[PDB]
Amino acid sequence: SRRWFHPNITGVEAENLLLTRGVDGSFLARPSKSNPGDFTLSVRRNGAVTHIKIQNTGDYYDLYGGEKFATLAELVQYYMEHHGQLKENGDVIELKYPLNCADPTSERWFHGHLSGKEAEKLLTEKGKHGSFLVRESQSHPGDFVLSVRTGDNDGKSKVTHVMIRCQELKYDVGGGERFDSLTDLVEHYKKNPMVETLGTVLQLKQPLNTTRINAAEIESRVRELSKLQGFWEEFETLQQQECKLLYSRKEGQRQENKNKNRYKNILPFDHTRVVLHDGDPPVSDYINANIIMPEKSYIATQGCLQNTVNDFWRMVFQENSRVIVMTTKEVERGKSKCVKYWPDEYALKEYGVMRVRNVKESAAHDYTLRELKLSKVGQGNTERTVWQYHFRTWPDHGVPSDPGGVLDFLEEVHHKQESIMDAGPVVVHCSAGIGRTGTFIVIDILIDIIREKGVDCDIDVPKTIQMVRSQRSGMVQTEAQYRFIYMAVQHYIETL
Ligand SMILES: CC1(CN)CCN(c2ncc(Sc3cccnc3C(F)(F)F)c(=O)[nH]2)CC1
């Protein structure tokens, strides 16, 4: 569960919630009201409430007096499973009891102010057996309507509406149990379905999809998402689903692999990590990288450390990658983001058993292309060209104001990859390998659908992102990037 996240509470409401309904060790997370784009962890300790800032400019969640994390769920799990780690003066803050949110605003199935006719239209056109939604009742204010489609324009399927009464701060379907929130009600009737008098089982199988759009209508959806904004509601609804992606990251936590990570808590999932087989004959199989498969593949990786440069080249070699996309400068804000893992132009360098020649560098407005020759030492016939695309104009914080630059870059990367017979996955990296990396990969995936299937294809931005996030933690870090993905897709369709 991710019930500890409250999307619409102020710091004052948070303070009162913890003092009146919480105990020492109670906590919640919320979006920052003082500075949008930031978050706050509000914790009760010794009868008083502490507010801890969580910053995210696009690379990771940075907790004050704490560590750097790929998601808020990974952050919460870490402190709930590793005590004495979160520090104030040096005092230890304990996250013991998540204070649960009753607000349905970020539920996939909740549609708030939506009319019964619009809901029946959506369920008829986009629905399937067990598709459901919850909307606010217009006739009886304060009440709700649960609409479910069941079946297989021939009457083989139908929509059933169930009234949800809100009586004295609790929710019920006219009889039986009375629930503290719409979520508890939905969860209960998902496990224990209501059976109609003549036998129809009202299965709440899956929330109705309202995010899948036809590509040609992107501008229309972007316009709707810009109204009071829709982008934030959709992004936060996708964020709520991150609790389902807490997969094991054991290999990255091993003592011998600790120093191979740029950020100690930003780790590759064990089930998709790139396993290195060269093996100098103790632990030579690890790199902080994951294979990203749509549904052309990618490897999403962090910026090299001085001690991981040789592992990076072994990975590029093993996977037969011919294209690298670097989305960061080596130094940003005086901080090292990626070490220079390539030789100077015309120079030849050995990185362990791998040999790399920088043949030629070409400078474009937004990027530099480096033509590299990679081979294994003592094996001349293993030589292959590796094209390194280094995007250099991405801002220090946030995203570019126009996606034109990124799109032209991605179009070039795509054409290079397509021209090379049996090229392995495209390697993509930034600093932590999750924010800018995930942003570039998601745009690439979406535009690839528009290339193949044309402008009448179906695209679903949150579905694509959830799919990439199941293969590497926190792929696409912020709301700014989420909106940038929609803007990029919109610009592409418009220039077609
Ligand atoms: C009005 C809303 C108020 N909450 C906001 C917008 N909206 C919505 N936004 C995001 C998601 S997530 C999603 C989407 C598609 C496929 N898979 C997922 C997964 F994988 F993440 F589960 C969703 O289901 N619906 C409908 C409800």
Side-chain angles (χ1 to χ4, degrees), residues 12 19 34 57 89 91 93 175 185 242 274 327-328 346 384 425 432:
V12 160
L19 294 168
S34 72
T57 62
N89 55 16
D91 273 50
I93 300 146
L185 192 145
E242 84 186 2
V274 170
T327 68
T328 183
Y346 313 122
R384 82 289 312 282

Side-chain angles (χ1 to χ4, degrees), residues 239-253:
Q239 297 296 80
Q240 186 186 297
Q241 300 296 295
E242 84 186 2
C243 56
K244 292 176 176 178
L245 310 175
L246 299 157
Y247 304 128
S248 67
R249 305 155 298 255
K250 289 171 193 292
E251 295 299 318
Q253 289 179 247

Side-chain angles (χ1 to χ4, degrees), residues 104-112 207-212 221 225 230-242 244-245 460-467 469 482 486:
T105 50
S106 304
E107 297 285 352
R108 301 184 61 201
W109 43 260
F110 188 69
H111 291 274
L208 179 73
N209 186 302
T210 59
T211 60
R212 173 178 59 250
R221 185 45 57 92
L225 291 174
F231 282 114
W232 185 94
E233 275 210 354
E234 192 177 282
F235 181 64
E236 283 314 315
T237 298
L238 168 61
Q239 297 296 80
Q240 186 186 297
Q241 300 296 295
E242 84 186 2
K244 292 176 176 178
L245 310 175
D460 192 344
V461 173
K463 188 181 263 184
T464 292
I465 300 181
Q466 187 71 349
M467 180 268 292
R469 279 175 184 184
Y482 193 71
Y486 269 100

Side-chain angles (χ1 to χ4, degrees), residues 219-235:
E219 187 157 50
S220 186
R221 185 45 57 92
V222 164
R223 191 167 68 247
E224 192 74 21
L225 291 174
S226 303
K227 305 202 287 195
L228 310 149
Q229 305 175 289
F231 282 114
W232 185 94
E233 275 210 354
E234 192 177 282
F235 181 64

Side-chain angles (χ1 to χ4, degrees), residues 218-494:
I218 185 89
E219 187 157 50
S220 186
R221 185 45 57 92
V222 164
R223 191 167 68 247
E224 192 74 21
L225 291 174
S226 303
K227 305 202 287 195
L228 310 149
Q229 305 175 289
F231 282 114
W232 185 94
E233 275 210 354
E234 192 177 282
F235 181 64
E236 283 314 315
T237 298
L238 168 61
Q239 297 296 80
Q240 186 186 297
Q241 300 296 295
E242 84 186 2
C243 56
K244 292 176 176 178
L245 310 175
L246 299 157
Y247 304 128
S248 67
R249 305 155 298 255
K250 289 171 193 292
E251 295 299 318
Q253 289 179 247
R254 283 164 55 91
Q255 184 63 38
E256 312 98 319
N257 292 337
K258 285 183 197 295
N259 75 327
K260 300 179 194 165
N261 305 309
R262 190 165 272 281
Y263 309 93
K264 64 172 280 182
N265 307 320
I266 297 167
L267 300 175
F269 290 138
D270 292 324
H271 78 290
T272 59
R273 71 176 188 98
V274 170
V275 182
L276 299 188
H277 297 288
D278 306 59
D280 175 334
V283 64
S284 58
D285 77 330
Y286 181 87
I287 189 167
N288 191 324
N290 298 92
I291 299 291
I292 310 303
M293 293 198 70
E295 210 137 70
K296 177 224 244 124
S297 268
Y298 314 83
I299 291 169
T301 192
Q302 68 175 18
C304 289
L305 288 158
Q306 58 166 0
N307 64 308
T308 70
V309 175
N310 302 357
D311 293 330
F312 178 90
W313 285 107
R314 284 167 64 208
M315 173 181 77
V316 171
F317 188 83
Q318 182 178 285
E319 301 297 312
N320 194 40
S321 304
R322 301 309 178 85
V323 182
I324 304 168
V325 173
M326 178 168 176
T327 68
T328 183
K329 286 186 182 67
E330 285 166 60
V331 189
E332 282 184 8
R333 294 168 63 84
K335 290 140 134 63
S336 172
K337 298 298 164 180
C338 184
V339 300
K340 182 170 174 287
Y341 57 84
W342 65 90
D344 297 335
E345 189 179 36
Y346 313 122
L348 181 81
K349 249 197 167 170
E350 295 189 357
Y351 302 98
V353 306
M354 299 298 163
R355 183 179 276 140
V356 182
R357 181 178 305 278
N358 181 344
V359 173
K360 193 80 193 74
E361 298 196 4
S362 305
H365 186 263
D366 285 313
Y367 73 95
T368 295
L369 166 67
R370 306 192 182 87
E371 175 177 349
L372 315 171
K373 297 294 155 148
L374 163 67
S375 69
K376 193 165 161 285
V377 159
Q379 258 154 255
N381 212 179
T382 71
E383 194 203 278
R384 82 289 312 282
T385 306
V386 173
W387 302 89
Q388 185 219 34
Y389 288 87
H390 187 170
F391 199 89
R392 321 164 327 245
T393 60
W394 191 282
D396 292 341
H397 292 340
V399 301
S401 59
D402 187 74
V406 161
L407 290 162
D408 301 340
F409 173 82
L410 245 34
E411 199 66 21
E412 196 53 39
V413 169
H414 174 79
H415 290 124
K416 180 67 66 166
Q417 175 71 2
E418 199 166 14
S419 73
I420 305 162
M421 187 72 85
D422 307 312
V426 175
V427 171
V428 188
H429 75 84
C430 48
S431 52
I434 62 179
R436 294 178 194 182
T437 293
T439 304
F440 278 72
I441 292 169
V442 174
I443 299 165
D444 201 55
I445 288 169
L446 297 173
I447 284 162
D448 225 308
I449 300 150
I450 302 158
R451 296 174 188 293
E452 181 194 30
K453 292 181 224 159
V455 97
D456 305 316
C457 68
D458 278 339
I459 67 116
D460 192 344
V461 173
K463 188 181 263 184
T464 292
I465 300 181
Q466 187 71 349
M467 180 268 292
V468 170
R469 279 175 184 184
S470 73
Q471 308 170 77
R472 186 167 168 92
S473 318
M475 292 291 272
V476 186
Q477 281 288 295
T478 60
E479 196 217 332
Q481 290 163 353
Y482 193 71
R483 186 185 269 95
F484 184 84
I485 289 149
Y486 269 100
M487 296 311 178
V489 166
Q490 182 181 217
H491 187 110
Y492 184 83
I493 288 150
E494 276 174 24

Side-chain angles (χ1 to χ4, degrees), residues 33-267:
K33 289 282 186 186
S34 72
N35 192 336
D38 291 325
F39 299 88
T40 309
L41 176 56
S42 309
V43 200
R44 170 141 167 204
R45 198 200 182 260
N46 245 69
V49 172
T50 299
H51 302 280
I52 312 160
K53 190 171 189 281
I54 301 159
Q55 188 174 127
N56 199 331
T57 62
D59 308 316
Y60 44 68
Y61 293 92
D62 185 354
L63 178 71
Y64 176 82
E67 263 289 341
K68 292 171 184 102
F69 296 90
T71 79
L72 286 182
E74 291 194 352
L75 187 156
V76 170
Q77 182 191 52
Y78 178 86
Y79 293 106
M80 282 190 82
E81 204 57 52
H82 303 73
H83 281 257
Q85 287 298 328
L86 186 52
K87 284 169 259 75
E88 198 83 71
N89 55 16
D91 273 50
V92 293
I93 300 146
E94 285 154 19
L95 303 198
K96 285 191 186 181
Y97 313 104
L99 195 141
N100 297 342
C101 184
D103 196 355
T105 50
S106 304
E107 297 285 352
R108 301 184 61 201
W109 43 260
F110 188 69
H111 291 274
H113 184 75
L114 183 86
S115 72
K117 279 157 181 171
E118 281 159 13
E120 214 175 77
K121 189 198 173 195
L122 293 168
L123 281 168
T124 310
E125 297 160 347
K126 300 158 175 70
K128 66 191 186 78
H129 174 74
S131 302
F132 72 98
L133 61 89
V134 178
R135 54 171 190 91
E136 289 173 10
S137 198
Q138 285 164 304
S139 65
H140 340 274
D143 277 9
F144 296 90
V145 183
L146 164 71
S147 312
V148 208
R149 171 172 166 147
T150 55
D152 208 319
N153 217 314
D154 50 40
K156 265 188 166 198
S157 288
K158 54 150 168 191
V159 172
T160 303
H161 309 272
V162 176
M163 259 299 307
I164 299 173
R165 291 203 66 184
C166 179
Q167 304 179 79
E168 277 294 298
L169 296 148
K170 281 180 190 198
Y171 304 88
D172 66 81
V173 299
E177 298 313 314
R178 289 179 68 241
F179 305 93
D180 293 312
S181 63
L182 286 168
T183 297
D184 293 339
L185 192 145
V186 166
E187 280 321 293
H188 183 269
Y189 291 107
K190 250 156 80 168
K191 297 196 245 82
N192 317 290
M194 286 167 283
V195 177
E196 287 206 309
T197 178
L198 280 168
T200 297
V201 181
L202 297 178
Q203 191 180 3
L204 309 180
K205 210 173 194 170
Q206 66 284 307
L208 179 73
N209 186 302
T210 59
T211 60
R212 173 178 59 250
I213 50 140
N214 179 279
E217 71 187 20
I218 185 89
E219 187 157 50
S220 186
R221 185 45 57 92
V222 164
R223 191 167 68 247
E224 192 74 21
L225 291 174
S226 303
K227 305 202 287 195
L228 310 149
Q229 305 175 289
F231 282 114
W232 185 94
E233 275 210 354
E234 192 177 282
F235 181 64
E236 283 314 315
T237 298
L238 168 61
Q239 297 296 80
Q240 186 186 297
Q241 300 296 295
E242 84 186 2
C243 56
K244 292 176 176 178
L245 310 175
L246 299 157
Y247 304 128
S248 67
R249 305 155 298 255
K250 289 171 193 292
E251 295 299 318
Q253 289 179 247
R254 283 164 55 91
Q255 184 63 38
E256 312 98 319
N257 292 337
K258 285 183 197 295
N259 75 327
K260 300 179 194 165
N261 305 309
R262 190 165 272 281
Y263 309 93
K264 64 172 280 182
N265 307 320
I266 297 167
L267 300 175

